[PDB]
Design a protein around this ligand. Structure first.
Ligand code: HEM
Ligand code: HEM
Ligand SMILES: C[C@H](O)[C@H](O)[C@H]1CNc2nc(N)[nH]c(=O)c2N1
Ligand SMILES: C[C@H](O)[C@H](O)[C@H]1CNc2nc(N)[nH]c(=O)c2N1
Ligand SMILES: NC(=[NH2+])NCCC[C@H](N)C(=O)O
Ligand SMILES: NC(=[NH2+])NCCC[C@H](N)C(=O)O
Ligand SMILES: [Zn+2]
Lengths: 409, 411
């Protein structure tokens, strides 16, 4: 019932009770753990209980649990549901729900900042142009000339599933990927397909190594449309090393604003299918994953070459030596250009502090170890030595099928 | 109910049916994952069924399932159990059992070598001195002058739980740890408690930074006894860097033979509480964990200074830079002295192949991602991108409480 989690580097022991309020499933069972698996409409009868769950926690959070207001709102929503077969969140609820969905994202290491989320209510939106306007405003607000601010823009909630809003891009800002004759790939391999759907839509690709993709926005169910983000609104950082002058020649750059746009925000049973959100990068995401993953920019060899390291034998750890340098470069560039960014050491230390805060103020903190521990230097960051309990709480952010695999043109 | 795992780097998908034969629990539920949690006498009534499942697996492995030999064996064990409340494994079954416990160890990345395990049967052992002799033989055989050979030594199984054989050391070879009155620790902090017990038992500690601990052996439930492993049998490697001549001046060294000696081996319901086994190191075990964990030798700072790294701010990644060097030094020193060792790229690549093979020939391979993925450069090794399923199969290696916490001292 009352689970305990130990930190093996400090011996600190936290007790978890928050998991008891868990509602969703984990993919795991008593006979099998699926902890490392990436991916393990509602009826009036399904909806009301969810709304109640939320409202009860919402009112409890504002110290008015079982108040007239609580009961009243509870009744009002109840009636609205039985009638409209759905409901609308007050603004106070939308904000609390979005913040808590971030608070509950077990895979996010940057949650110590959860309560500072800026919420942009775009529930009054009705067209791709409208969505494009909202997104440009989000980008400018969050980028803030390099002094990044976390934010989320919430489009109209789902109704019949045939009127859903969706941002086809996986992130507001990403580089294109094209399959060349060589069989190899130009640009970002992860976006090879989307890069094609755009073209399949009319996008004139500059066919470069770092071409900012165009937004493909879908509103009210209609087919999606393209829009190019004002270049002046896309902050970029040219990647250079603080010692290897040749580094600049590698021709590398990345965008400063990471903004996941393909997820689904769930609040009180209501589903928001278009809810792009952004914060700021942890160095390793770019330097380790985007730059060194074999199926991404896969740039380790080149950097190793330029460093003239013995690539004859894996035991010389050239891949490792280079990995470190590349990552030092990213953090150095961003910092040099005063663009917000956090290193994995500082980010992981903050998460540990945040976990302690959450354990003493909330009785727990769902966390997915597999995602929290950085892709490099795992054990020299404190989270590696931190036992974590993963469970699903609502409100939450959930994965959802790529629209192009569901859209009925 | 089939289950598929995908490798997000190669899009290769494998199907697992093996998990269906999993009986033990995981610690997880439909509502919570305890995947990153370190640690989540039998009766006749429960023993025979365990023995049978085991014998059924063994006879199938040798293609004699349902044979007369199979039936007679079941009948014999059955009789032996009702007769004596337990039973003895044949030599063949023991070897098969030991190899499969290794094959089933979800946290071991070296399993591609599972079938080549050398099994030493020490079930006729009756005393601590006898245990010491078996252990010395295991160390010399396994060490093989630097050309390491995997091996396991199996002492008498548990009976009533009051006559257990136990190796009190956590590894056959390990360095002493000493807490100083000024609060600092000399040697390996991981072994301070055990070191105290040794001193209390009579061990005259030299009190240096790399003193090989004495063996503390318990036979037949008796009080444990101390024994010094002949130094000539303990292979050690002085650590030096291929480009930094000052590295040798850190005065670091490590032993060449890693031999976990505190786990419990379960086979067909039988419990082997003293079953020390050994393989060869993966570089990062020493270089990342033993040397750089804040709670182990914790050498990152000192190595950082010597490299004149910008230690003013973490974003300089001076810890990361120094970590790589230390691990390069460990691999280099070992290879130079021709002592078997495997780097994490090589070991993880081998585990991926092993895993794929296992899915194809066995229907799966239980694996603990949290433990399989190396402590440094996680994503540049293929295991990071590999989805894995973790479940418990028997035979298996299990954790057991430290004996000093359960032993009834006799005096
Ligand atoms: C402000 C700084 C932030 C930092 C430093 C941070 C860091 C991270 C990191 C390192 C990951 C893993 C990314 C990956 O491997 O692809 C992650 C995942 C995630 N974060 Fe954040 N985050 C921040 C803000 C946000 C915000 C504002 C939200 C939502 C409102 C959020 C929601 C999540 C979710 C749901 C995931 C998992 C996404 C997935 O499954 O792909 N994060 N974050
Ligand atoms: C031959 C080379 C071998 C290599 C390279 C290898 C590698 C590894 C590594 C790197 C770990 C993680 C250790 C840690 O983090 O403390 C591990 C764990 C494990 N290995 Fe091996 N191994 C080998 C042989 C063996 C043998 C011979 C057995 C059994 C007969 C075995 C059983 C296990 C077990 C049960 C664990 C988990 C131990 C624990 O929970 O503390 N391994 N192995
Ligand atoms: C298969 C495995 O789950 C997968 O590679 C995971 C591992 N940990 C991760 N951790 C983070 N933060 N992000 C990821 O994309 C992944 N990928
Ligand atoms: C808390 C966390 O489970 C713990 O630090 C684990 C993580 N992965 C590990 N992996 C290996 N190989 N060895 C370990 O000791 C650990 N420790
Ligand atoms: N820090 C963040 N908000 N990250 C969001 C995910 C970005 C993704 N990991 C990338 O490197 O492109
Ligand atoms: N490869 C092995 N057999 N390892 C056994 C465990 C050794 C332990 N991790 C150590 O660093 O001492
Ligand atoms: Zn699990």
């Amino acid at each position: 019932r009352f689970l305990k989690v130990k930190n093996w580097e400090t011996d600190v022991v936290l007790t978890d009770t928050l998991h008891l309020k868990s509602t969703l499933e984990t993919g795991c069972t008593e006979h099998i753990c699926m902890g490392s698996i990436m991916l393990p409409v509602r009826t009036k009868d399904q909806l009301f209980p969810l709304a109640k769950e939320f409202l009860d926690q919402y009112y409890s959070s504002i110290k008015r649990f079982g108040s007239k207001a609580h009961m009243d709102r509870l009744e009002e929503v109840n009636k609205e549901i039985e009638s409209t077969s759905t409901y609308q969140l007050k603004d106070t609820e939308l904000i609390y729900g979005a913040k808590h969905a971030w608070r509950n994202a077990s895979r996010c290491v940057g949650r110590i900042q959860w309560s500072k989320l800026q919420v942009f209510d775009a529930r009054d939106c009705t067209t791709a142009h409208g969505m494009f306007n909202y997104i440009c405003n989000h980008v400018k607000y969050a980028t803030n000339k390099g002094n990044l601010r976390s934010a989320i823009t919430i489009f109209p909630q789902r109704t019949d599933g045939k009127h859903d809003f969706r941002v086809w891009n996986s992130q507001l800002i990403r580089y294109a990927g094209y399959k060349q004759p060589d069989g190899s790939t130009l640009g970002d391999p992860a976006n090879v397909q989307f890069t094609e759907i755009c073209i399949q839509q009319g996008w004139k690709a500059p066919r470069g190594r770092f071409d900012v993709l165009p937004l493909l926005l879908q509103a009210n169910g209609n087919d999606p449309e393209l829009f190019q983000i004002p270049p002046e609104l896309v902050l970029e950082v040219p990647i250079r090393h603080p010692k290897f002058d040749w580094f600049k020649d590698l021709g590398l750059k990345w965008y400063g604003l990471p903004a996941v746009s393909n997820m689904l925000l769930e609040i009180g049973g209501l589903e928001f299918s278009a809810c792009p959100f952004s914060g700021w990068y942890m160095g390793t995401e770019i330097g380790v994953r985007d730059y060194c993953d074999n199926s991404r920019y896969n740039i380790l060899e080149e950097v190793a070459k330029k460093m003239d390291l013995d690539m004859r034998k894996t035991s010389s750890l050239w891949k490792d030596q280079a990995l470190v340098e590349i990552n030092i470069a990213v953090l150095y560039s961003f910092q040099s250009d005063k663009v917000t960014i956090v290193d994995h050491h500082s980010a992981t230390e903050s998460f540990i502090k945040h976990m302690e805060n959450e354990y003493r103020c909330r009785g727990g903190c769902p966390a997915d170890w597999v995602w929290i521990v950085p892709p490099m230097s795992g054990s020299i960051t404190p989270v590696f030595h931190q036992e974590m309990l993963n469970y699903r709480l609502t409100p939450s952010f959930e994965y959802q099928p790529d629209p192009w695999n569901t859209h009925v043109w």
